[PDB]
């Protein structure tokens, strides 16, 4: 490898400004650059760096073919449902983890940066669906989930309910009712020659 290809845009994933809600999860593939992971385990702001897969110490000795960073804003104690195989209101009709999700998951802490005195009403989450989502899949089609057998041509009423409900965020204690931020780094195994190794000599 040459001296340095380019600094990875990976810092922007952690310290960007605007994030997407859980219903529309956003992704970003990291292109060819020298891996910069030494600044992760040394930071004290991280408190949920628990992840199953490769060792959390031999990060500079890895050459995964391609890496993705996925971001969402699931709130509070709902984070723990992200694990190698779980079910629930979040990992049923939203972000789902397979048994081969090699990589790691990172959680943040919420503050006045993502909050409002009046409240937040621009954040949505899926609550009604008809089947479990396949891993790493999204379903964006929101008219009616047809709870009843009556026609649901688009009239709000009995047996025809909306499938999306807005989050409600207010300044509170914050144990499990704050807009936490969760990102997932996902690695691939082998489809192309390795490009993101991080040696220097």
């Amino acid at each position, epitope marked *: 490898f040459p001296n340095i290809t380019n600094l990875c845009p990976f810092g922007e994933v952690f310290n960007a400004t605007r994030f997407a809600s859980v219903y529309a999860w956003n992704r970003k593939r990291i292109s060819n650059c020298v891996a910069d992971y030494s600044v992760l385990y040394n930071s004290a702001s991280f408190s949920t760096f628990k992840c199953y897969g490769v060792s959390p110490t031999k990060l500079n000795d890895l050459c995964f073919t391609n890496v993705y960073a996925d971001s969402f804003v699931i709130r509070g104690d709902e984070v723990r449902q992200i694990a190698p195989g779980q079910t629930g*209101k979040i990992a*049923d009709y939203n972000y789902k983890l397979p048994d081969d999700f090699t990589g790691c998951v990172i959680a943040w802490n919420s503050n006045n940066l993502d909050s409002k005195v009046g409240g937040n009403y621009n954040y949505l989450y899926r609550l009604f669906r008809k*089947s479990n989502l396949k891993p790493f899949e999204r379903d964006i089609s929101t008219e009616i989930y047809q709870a*009843g057998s009556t026609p649901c041509n688009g009239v709000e009423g009995f047996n025809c*309910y909306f499938p999306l*409900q807005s989050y409600g965020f207010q300044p509170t204690n914050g144990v499990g009712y704050q807009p936490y931020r969760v990102v997932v780094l996902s690695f691939e195994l082998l489809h192309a020659p390795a490009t993101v190794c991080g040696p220097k000599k």
Partner: single-chain antibody, 225 residues
């Protein structure tokens, strides 16, 4: 005309096997949340089980593993198999659909009775015996201080099934008269009935959702001095 019929009124031998049944009357069970709750006579209500669309199963904290709830779309049933049953498990086993965010337990079943061998939520006021012609105040406090709209209210009736009064502490359910009001925020909520009517003397409960296993209040009965 949604109806939920049940048939479980049978005495059970010690360590016996029973099978309850909840049917449907127009709405498919494969597209909506379902829940089984325990009445626990002599005390407040409590939670038993929840089935999501899909078919993931959530059980209460007191009981682990032994409860076996099953869903049958072929006959449109919400079966629950009671295995070997121990002491202090005699209560009613209501079943109801769940729309927690938008309307909490709008329609319930009818109830049953199973015999035996041979978040900190509290509600303050109490009986508060009064007379018709004025209003009243019912206060429901909480220890966790749920933020905005995850608390609802229910009304009991002797021999009947629980009904819905207000969902999310902001708007009442359909068919509710305009004499019921609710307010409050932060830690406690207040509910008021104006122009008391003879068809209003009933026990009121406050329930919390959108959190750890759902909890109801102990019970506030209204009586005439």
């Amino acid at each position: 005309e949604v109806q939920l019929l049940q048939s479980a009124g049978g005495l059970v031998q010690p360590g016996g096997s029973l099978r309850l049944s909840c049917a449907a009357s127009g709405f498919t069970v494969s597209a909506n949340y379902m829940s089984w709750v325990r009445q626990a006579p002599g005390k407040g209500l409590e939670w038993v089980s929840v089935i999501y669309p899909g078919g993931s199963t959530f059980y209460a904290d007191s009981v682990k593993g032994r409860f076996t709830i099953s869903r049958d779309n072929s006959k449109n049933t919400l079966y629950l198999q009671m295995n070997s049953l121990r002491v202090e498990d005699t209560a009613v086993y209501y079943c109801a659909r769940d729309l927690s965010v938008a309307g909490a337990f709008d329609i319930w079943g009818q109830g049953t009775l199973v015999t035996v061998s041979s978040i900190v939520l509290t509600q303050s006021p109490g009986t508060l015996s009064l007379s018709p012609g004025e209003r009243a105040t019912l206060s429901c406090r909480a220890s966790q201080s749920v933020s905005s709209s995850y608390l609802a209210w229910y009304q009991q009736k002797p021999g009947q099934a629980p009904r819905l009064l207000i969902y999310g502490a902001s708007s009442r359910a359909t068919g509710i008269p305009d004499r019921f009001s609710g307010s409050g925020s932060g830690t406690d909520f207040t509910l008021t009935i104006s122009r008391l009517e003879p068809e209003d003397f009933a026990v009121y409960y406050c329930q919390q959702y959108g959190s750890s296993p759902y909890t109801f209040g102990q019970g506030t009965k209204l009586e005439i001095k």
